Amino acid sequence: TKFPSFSQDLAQDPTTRRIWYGIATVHDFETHDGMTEENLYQKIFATHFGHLSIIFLWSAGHLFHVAWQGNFEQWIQDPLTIRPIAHAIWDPHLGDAATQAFTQAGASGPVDLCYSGLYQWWYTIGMRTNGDLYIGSVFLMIVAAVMLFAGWLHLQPKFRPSLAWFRDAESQMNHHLAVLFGASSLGWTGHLIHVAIPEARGQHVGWDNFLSTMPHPAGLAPFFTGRWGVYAQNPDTAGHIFGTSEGAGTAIITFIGGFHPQTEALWLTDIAHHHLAIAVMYIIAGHMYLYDTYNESLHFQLGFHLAALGVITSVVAQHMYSLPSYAFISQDHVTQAALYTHHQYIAGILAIGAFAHGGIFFVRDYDPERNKNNVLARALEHKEAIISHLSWVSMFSGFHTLGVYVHNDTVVAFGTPEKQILVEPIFAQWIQPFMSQGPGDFLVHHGIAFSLHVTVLICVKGCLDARGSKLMPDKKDFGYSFPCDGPGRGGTCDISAWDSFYLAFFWMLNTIGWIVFYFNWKHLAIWSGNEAQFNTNSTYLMGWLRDYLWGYSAQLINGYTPFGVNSLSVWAWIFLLGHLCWATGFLFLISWRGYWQELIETLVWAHQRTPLANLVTWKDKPVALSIVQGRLVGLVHFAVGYYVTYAAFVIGATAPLG
């Protein structure tokens, strides 16, 4: 059957495997039939415009919805008591009770409270009316229209960029550093100085009056001559109220440091300074400006960029709660928990994605001859060593961390908490925005250490053994994703490199889970004033189960009761949806293909033999999902479940507290 157009192997599959594998391979452009590197890069090029158009229409939706259905105005008036709103609920299924309960934040009808700090971010960058947002939205739809127009025009042979424009990666690297990053950085400082900071200081800047307005009275005279002094004018008084004349300074570039007290956020002036500095550094480096493999392999490129975006989004999460850059976001606890957990989980996805494409590189692109004695060749030279070391630090950190937590559990249970192995984080004290690191924090840090170790252990045993191993010397033959080599050599289930990404996603979720668990319990403790609770109970595992999971679940799971619904109903329900989704992942992770294939055989029999029903038949012979599809659907359920459950819990834990 035609679909999938690109793969005749599949298109001639007489089964439902053709539809699944189609959708699974529909973006592995490399593997499409008759795909030359030229067309490959051109196709990829156009897809990226599609992606970006999506991101812009996504942002567009944010602004459109908050404008139309939000309470952004009411919130800018009372940003500490008004709950900000994400969008309207129209759902024919809600009962009157649930419409009433979701009728919140002084909204006429049922709404969803926002928890992306979008209100805070927009207030900070200057937006003050629904008009500013509506214009942002319509603008961003038009940007997306342009980006789509672009991908279309580009794939059109008129402007179809040949292999040249892509082979010029070095040019692209320098351009990214300066022409994109640097340029946009200082453009953003433009926005900050002209609109953000004014609107912060109570002065309305529209698009029609900023030509009129000058940011700094001394501005032009300072520009190009004694720029540093004039720019550092009267700094904004602590008295200053955000978006009011009261205590408004005039400085546009400063190094005041710390946080604006009203908003408990980094000074807009400090941010503008930061960005100006970042821009200068980036542009200078641009002007100033494994080679073989990186240019050769697009997998190497993504892998690198994913590991990059991995660390970047991790630091974004780590910094965006410690060093709030948005007004009132520090006070909005649910948003800050949500954003941290969000960005940390996306961090873990981008990280593991790095190692995934790592392994794809090692089975599709890495030629051992091509690079005689490169870093990668040396890495493989002593795989057994890199793995034995990662193994050891894993077994070590693991045995000891679990042992200590279990020791603490045992002695505390036996009613002798004195006997606990409480180790103080001395180096944390030395280094220390920074919150008290106790012996609890120590144990959890080591947990996270161990888990991150086992994750990299797995997703490197993957990318190293991808080429092969004693159990399967020639894996590169069979490729990245394949079921197994059969029950041949004691059994080879899960021997592929894809299987290592699969086995490591679990550890990535465990690791980020420990991270965000620690984050959220610590913060709930402080946000309730019972930081004592964390400090005392975080040292044995029953304390995590009793105080974190058991204790902060109560509100959420009372979201709907036989007595009635409250606003947390939708979260209680999502909480269960995530438990169900997670567990459903176990169906696919534990029950493997053969059981199902026998069962489905019998259903094919029953269908063919049932009068009236037999009148219709499949086009595609029903078959059980593939070995690997079982693993993949398992993992997507497990992951989706994991995320949805925890998202529900993060929201439901923090929301009642505030």
Binding site: F3, R18, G22, A88, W90, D91
Partner: peptide, 30 residues
């Protein structure tokens, strides 16, 4: 256009989802 929700939601979810599922059905069965 307070009602636009009560139109856009069934249109997109029921009618668009239906049409999408129909189209994807034709697409993977032709």
């Amino acid at each position: 256009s307070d009602i636009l929700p009560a139109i856009m939601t069934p249109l997109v979810v029921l009618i668009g989802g239906g049409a999408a599922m129909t189209a994807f059905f034709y697409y993977v069965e032709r």
